[PDB]
Write a protein that binds this ligand. Structure first.
Ligand SMILES: [Zn+2]
Lengths: 222, 17, 31
C-alpha cells in the first residue's frame, strides 16, 4: 500500500530540491528530463490523488507559467482559458496558505502581499480578457464562463465587455492594442514576481518554510 | 521596520475597468 | 469516497499540474 507512498514522497522531495531556488524557477535543459519524469510519476501516482498540493509546487508552477525569471514580450505565456483558470486557482492557494500561516515589518509584508496579489490577479484577468477578444470567432461559451469564476461583477465592465464582444475584428484588435499599451505586461510581471518573493520571505521569516531566503534575511539585520 | 519593502511608496496598484 | 480511485484512473492536483506543465512545455518548444 504505502510502498507507493514512500516512493511518491521521495519524488516530491526530489522535485523540491529542483523547484526551490532563491530566485524564480525556470526549467533549464539539464533539469527538464528528471523534472518531467517526477511530475509524470506524481501525476499517475495512485497514492497522490487526494494529497494536498504543497505550496512550493504551486509557486514553481506560477513562476514557470508566467515566466517570472525575466523582467516579457507578453507572448511567452500560453493564454488558454483551461490553463489560466487553474493558474489563478493555484495562485489563490498560495495566497490562502500565506494568510493562514501568517496568523500563527510583518504588517508591511502581509499588507504588500495582499495589495500585490489583487494587482497581479487583476492583471492576469485583464490580459486573459485581452486574449479572449482577439479570437475570430469569439469563444463566448468559455469567455462568459470565465467572467463568472474570475473577474468581478460591475454593470460597467460586464456591459462594456458585451458591447465590445459584438463589435468586429479590427475594432476589437484596436481596443485591445490601445489597452495593452495602457496596461503593459511588464507592470504585472513585476507585481507577480514581487508578490511571489514577498510571499517567500514571510513564510521563511515567520512560518519557517525554507525558500532559500537566508541570505536575504541577514542583509536586513545589517 | 519600514513602511515600504517590496512596494514603492508612490506606486499605482489600482487597475481600472 | 472516490469512484475515480476505485476505477484506478488519473485525477487530482498533481495530475492537473502535470497536464498544465506539459501544455506550457509544448507551447514553448517552438516559441
Ligand atoms: Zn480519487
Amino acid at each position: 500500500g504505502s510502498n507507493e507512498k514512500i516512493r511518491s514522497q521521495s519524488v516530491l522531495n526530489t522535485l523540491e530540491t529542483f523547484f526551490i531556488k532563491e530566485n524564480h524557477y525556470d526549467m533549464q535543459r539539464e533539469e527538464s528530463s528528471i523534472v518531467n519524469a517526477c511530475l509524470r510519476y506524481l501525476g499517475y501516482s495512485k497514492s497522490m490523488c487526494h494529497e494536498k498540493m504543497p505550496i512550493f509546487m504551486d509557486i514553481a508552477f506560477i513562476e514557470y507559467c508566467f515566466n517570472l525569471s525575466l523582467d516579457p514580450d507578453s507572448q511567452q505565456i500560453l493564454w488558454e482559458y483551461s490553463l489560466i483558470s487553474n493558474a489563478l486557482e493555484r495562485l489563490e492557494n498560495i495566497e490562502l496558505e500565506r494568510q493562514n500561516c501568517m496568523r500563527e515589518n510583518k504588517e508591511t509584508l502581509n499588507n504588500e502581499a495582499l495589495k500585490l496579489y489583487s494587482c497581479a490577479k487583476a492583471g492576469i484577468c485583464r490580459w486573459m480578457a485581452f486574449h479572449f477578444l482577439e479570437q475570430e470567432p469569439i469563444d463566448h461559451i468559455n469567455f462568459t464562463k470565465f467572467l463568472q469564476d474570475w473577474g468581478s461583477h460591475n454593470e460597467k465592465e460586464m456591459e462594456a465587455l458585451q458591447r465590445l464582444s459584438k463589435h468586429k475584428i479590427r475594432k476589437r484588435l484596436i481596443y485591445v492594442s490601445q489597452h495593452k499599451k495602457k496596461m503593459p505586461w511588464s507592470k504585472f510581471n513585476s507585481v507577480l514576481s514581487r508578490y511571489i518573493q514577498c510571499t517567500k520571505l514571510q513564510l521563511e521569516v515567520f512560518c519557517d518554510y525554507d525558500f532559500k531566503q537566508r541570505e536575504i534575511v541577514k542583509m536586513l539585520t545589517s | 521596520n519600514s513602511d515600504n519593502i517590496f512596494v514603492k511608496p508612490g506606486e499605482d496598484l489600482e487597475i481600472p475597468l | 469516497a472516490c469512484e475515480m480511485c476505485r476505477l484506478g484512473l488519473p485525477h487530482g492536483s498533481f495530475f492537473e499540474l502535470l497536464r498544465d506543465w506539459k501544455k506550457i512545455e509544448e507551447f514553448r518548444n517552438k516559441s
